[PDB]
Design an enzyme around this catalytic site. Structure first.
Site, PDB file in Angstrom:
ATOM      1  N   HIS A 195       2.765   8.819   1.380  1.00  0.00           N
ATOM      2  CA  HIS A 195       1.801   8.697   0.320  1.00  0.00           C
ATOM      3  C   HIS A 195       2.287   9.684  -0.777  1.00  0.00           C
ATOM      4  O   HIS A 195       2.842  10.763  -0.463  1.00  0.00           O
ATOM      5  CB  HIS A 195       0.440   9.054   0.871  1.00  0.00           C
TER       6      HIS A 195
ATOM      7  N   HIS B  95       0.834  -1.216   0.000  1.00  0.00           N
ATOM      8  CA  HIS B  95       0.000   0.000   0.000  1.00  0.00           C
ATOM      9  C   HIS B  95       0.865   1.261   0.000  1.00  0.00           C
ATOM     10  O   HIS B  95       0.539   2.266  -0.644  1.00  0.00           O
ATOM     11  CB  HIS B  95      -0.902   0.029   1.227  1.00  0.00           C
TER      12      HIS B  95
ATOM     13  N   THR C  22      -5.920   7.061   7.787  1.00  0.00           N
ATOM     14  CA  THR C  22      -6.327   7.292   6.413  1.00  0.00           C
ATOM     15  C   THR C  22      -6.334   5.992   5.571  1.00  0.00           C
ATOM     16  O   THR C  22      -6.595   6.024   4.357  1.00  0.00           O
ATOM     17  CB  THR C  22      -5.398   8.309   5.763  1.00  0.00           C
ATOM     18  N   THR C  23      -5.974   4.871   6.185  1.00  0.00           N
ATOM     19  CA  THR C  23      -6.042   3.569   5.536  1.00  0.00           C
ATOM     20  C   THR C  23      -6.853   2.628   6.387  1.00  0.00           C
ATOM     21  O   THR C  23      -7.007   2.860   7.562  1.00  0.00           O
ATOM     22  CB  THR C  23      -4.657   2.947   5.357  1.00  0.00           C
TER      23      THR C  23
ATOM     24  N   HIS D  80       3.466  10.751   7.333  1.00  0.00           N
ATOM     25  CA  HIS D  80       2.832  10.619   8.607  1.00  0.00           C
ATOM     26  C   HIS D  80       3.793  10.018   9.577  1.00  0.00           C
ATOM     27  O   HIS D  80       4.383   8.974   9.283  1.00  0.00           O
ATOM     28  CB  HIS D  80       1.589   9.712   8.481  1.00  0.00           C
TER      29      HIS D  80
HETATM   30 ZN   LIG Z   1       0.200   7.482   6.197  1.00  0.00          ZN
END
Ligand SMILES: [Zn+2]
Length: 257
Positions: free
Chosen positions: A93, A61, A195-196, A116
């Site tokens: 990301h 991811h 956020t995932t 993050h």
């Molecule tokens: Zn992240």
């Protein structure tokens, strides 16, 4: 399972993780004309002197660097927080193109990328328990723009050949996360979520106003990573960001005027 593509991207997530449609979902758009400067807001305290990075992982991811969180080596406190949050990992990301890549947006603007620095509240004992608590995590989000090169990111860029595909990891000891911070710690803060998936609403988000610069050559090396595992058709890891979600019943506070 979940990803960023047309068949398993952010619009599908709710089917497996219904909280995806909840009240405190992340990321959001940061509207600087409605974010309010907040007096009760202490300065943010980043204590990353003793940080020990363990391993870097392509998880299919994104990539994450994982941190030894067995003691108070690397903590975030102050700002909007109560107590002490330990750094457990950082995730990144980014986009297919320079004008997109960030999860949070500021006045609808998308940055090239977003990092993050994920920390969990020491009062819950571990990350697992922390994520089940509305105040269990503090995530520091830092936007990246394409300009000049970030030396403190180069360590990361230089290891990415070793983790090109999902499932691959490499030792990544002695990485200094301080090298990923901008000069200013002016920030905006709001309650939200991972956020995932599993998208749990356990996060005090602390998003820094000042972006960092990375070179075009640095971001290009992120775009050469792969979503697929070794020996599967190659699918470039790009656009692994979730779009901004409804603010609903939340105010974003600014630590600065
Ligand atoms: Zn992240």
């Amino acid at each position: 399972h979940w990803g960023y593509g047309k068949h398993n991207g952010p619009e599908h997530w709710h089917k497996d993780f219904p909280i995806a449609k909840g009240e405190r979902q992340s990321p959001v758009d940061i509207d600087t004309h409605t974010a309010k400067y907040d007096p009760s807001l202490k300065p943010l305290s980043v204590s990353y002197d003793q940080a020990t990075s363990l391993r870097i992982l392509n998880n299919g991811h994104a990539f994450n660097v994982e941190f030894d969180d067995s003691q108070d080596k690397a903590v975030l406190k102050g700002g909007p927080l109560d107590g002490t949050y330990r750094l457990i990992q950082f995730c990144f990301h980014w986009g297919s193109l320079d004008g997109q890549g960030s999860e949070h947006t500021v006045d609808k603007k998308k940055y090239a990328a977003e990092l993050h620095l994920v920390h969990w509240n020491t009062k819950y004992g571990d990350f697992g328990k922390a994520v089940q608590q509305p105040d269990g995590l503090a995530v520091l989000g830092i936007f990246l723009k394409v300009g000049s090169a970030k030396p403190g990111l180069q360590k990361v860029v230089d290891v990415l050949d070793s983790i090109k595909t999902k499932g691959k990891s490499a030792d990544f000891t002695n990485f200094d996360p301080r090298g990923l911070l901008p000069e200013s710690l002016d920030y905006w803060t709001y309650p939200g979520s991972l956020t995932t998936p599993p998208l749990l609403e356990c996060v005090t988000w602390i998003v820094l106003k000042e972006p960092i610069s990375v070179s075009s050559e640095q971001v290009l090396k992120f775009r050469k990573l792969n979503f697929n595992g070794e020996g599967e058709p190659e699918e470039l890891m790009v656009d692994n960001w979730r779009p901004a979600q409804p603010l609903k019943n939340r105010q974003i506070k600014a630590s600065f005027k």
